[PDB]
């Protein structure tokens, strides 16, 4: 069986970072795989330091008998992934629980979008209104959804991304969902956004039924 | 190029079984083992079997001796992978995996995209797919924002791709919400340039394997 650390390790670019992995018995190799979030794992370095094809030379693998690691020399943003170990030297084969990278850049404020109900879904009887933030930094990011300035409360959910390998961002979505009959009850529909981009909250709202 | 085709999603009600394909290409089938591997949040990465299409010979790990059956069809080049009896605890993602030889060792040097397959007693339910058009509530120096409302589906996963996949710049796919009826919802947006807006064609193409539903919506001003 295989342990690495750290679960999560935190990363600027280009610092040079290192993550190990630890194996019960004495093991031949240990193989690495890199995985991003959607998506199957990628081999990454093969028989302990041996490089997959197209993997930089940035990356390498170190380590014997029962400690290896995996080091980058100056990490870089596409870097953001789970990394885990792999042991082939006894049956059956296991890995690792995975080391999470996170990439750490500066401030950026949310761009944000708002959307009415499109007219096919009004006709169903329902309305979903949808607000958008865009490519933010850091994670953390507050949505208040107000109706004819009402705060609302239990009528929304909202996801957001994985970071993203090109800027290091993360984007979010709230989805404000109404039925007809209540949507069509007022008119001022806004999503209030707090983040540290932003010295004072940002509001983007339309009034129903007004094109 | 090796590669290795693998169906979406599986919806499997408890107590049931489920038969999953694996269509290996770029490479001489039977000349080399394939491989199963189990992905949950909890276990982590975990390997099932393997099988030679060569003869059709089977080794298991210990665990799932009971719940997988791996055959091997050697004129088709598909292997297959047949889970029994399912339960919560089968809720994953399967892969099928190819290993490589170097050093004396193995790895897996080429997966398949994966089948998630959800356990539940409840029905499928095909979303419906509602456009998020660009405004001018919907614009920011110089760029548009724009998507698509998969709304209302079950179970997991939803797939989207944006002009068939030829537009993946800006694409934010988000995971998908999880609503109170057990049901998902899920978005996908694109921020594209506000001048061509009048040129270019914006479809998302929306993906729900376990509800057979393949749709392309056009999200226009």
């Known amino acids: 069986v295989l342990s690495q650390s750290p679960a999560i390790l935190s990363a600027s670019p280009g610092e040079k970072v290192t993550m190990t992995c630890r194996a019960s018995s004495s093991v031949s190799y240990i193989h690495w795989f890199q995985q991003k979030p959607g998506s199957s794992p990628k081999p990454w370095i093969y028989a302990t330091s041996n490089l997959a094809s197209g993997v930089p030379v940035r990356f390498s693998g170190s380590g014997s008998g029962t400690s290896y690691s995996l080091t980058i020399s100056r990490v870089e943003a596409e870097d953001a992934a789970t990394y885990y170990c792999?042991?082939?030297?006894?049956?059956?084969?296991?890995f690792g629980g995975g080391t999470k990278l996170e990439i750490k850049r500066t401030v950026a404020a949310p761009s944000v979008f708002i959307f009415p109900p499109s007219d096919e879904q009004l006709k169903s009887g329902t309305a979903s209104v949808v607000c958008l933030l865009n490519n933010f930094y850091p994670r953390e990011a507050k949505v208040q959804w107000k109706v004819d300035n009402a705060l609302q409360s239990g009528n929304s959910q909202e996801s957001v991304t994985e970071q993203d390998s090109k800027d290091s961002t993360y984007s979010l979505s709230s989805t404000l969902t109404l039925s007809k009959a209540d949507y069509e009850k007022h008119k001022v529909y806004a999503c209030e956004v707090t983040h540290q981009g932003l010295s004072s909250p940002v509001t983007k709202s339309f009034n129903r039924g007004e094109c | 190029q090796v590669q290795l085709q693998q169906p979406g999603a599986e919806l499997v009600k408890p107590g049931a079984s489920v038969k999953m394909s694996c269509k290996a290409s770029?490479?001489?089938?039977?000349?080399?083992?394939m491989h199963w591997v189990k992905q949950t949040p909890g276990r982590g990465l975990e390997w099932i079997g393997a099988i030679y299409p060569g003869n059709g010979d089977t080794s298991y790990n210990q665990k799932f001796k009971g719940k997988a059956t791996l055959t091997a069809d050697k004129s088709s080049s598909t292997a297959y992978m047949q889970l029994s009896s399912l339960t919560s605890e089968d809720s994953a993602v399967y892969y099928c995996?190819?290993?490589?030889?170097?050093?004396?060792?193995?790895?897996?040097?080429?997966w398949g995209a994966g089948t998630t397959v959800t356990v539940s007693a409840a029905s499928t339910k095909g979303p419906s797919v509602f456009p998020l058009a660009p405004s001018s509530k919907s614009t920011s120096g110089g760029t548009a924002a724009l998507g698509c409302l998969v709304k209302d589906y079950f179970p997991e996963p939803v797939t989207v791709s944006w002009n068939s996949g030829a537009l993946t710049s800006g694409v934010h796919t988000f995971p998908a919400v999880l609503q109170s009826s057990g049901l998902y919802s899920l978005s996908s947006v694109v921020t594209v340039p506000s001048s061509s807006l009048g040129t270019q064609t914006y479809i998302c193409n929306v993906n729900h394997k376990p509800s057979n539903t393949k749709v392309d919506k056009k999200v226009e001003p």
């Open positions: 770029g490479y001489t089938f039977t000349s080399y083992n």
């Open positions: 792999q042991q082939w030297t006894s049956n059956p084969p296991t």
């Open positions: 995996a190819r290993s490589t030889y170097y050093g004396g060792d193995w790895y897996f040097n080429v």
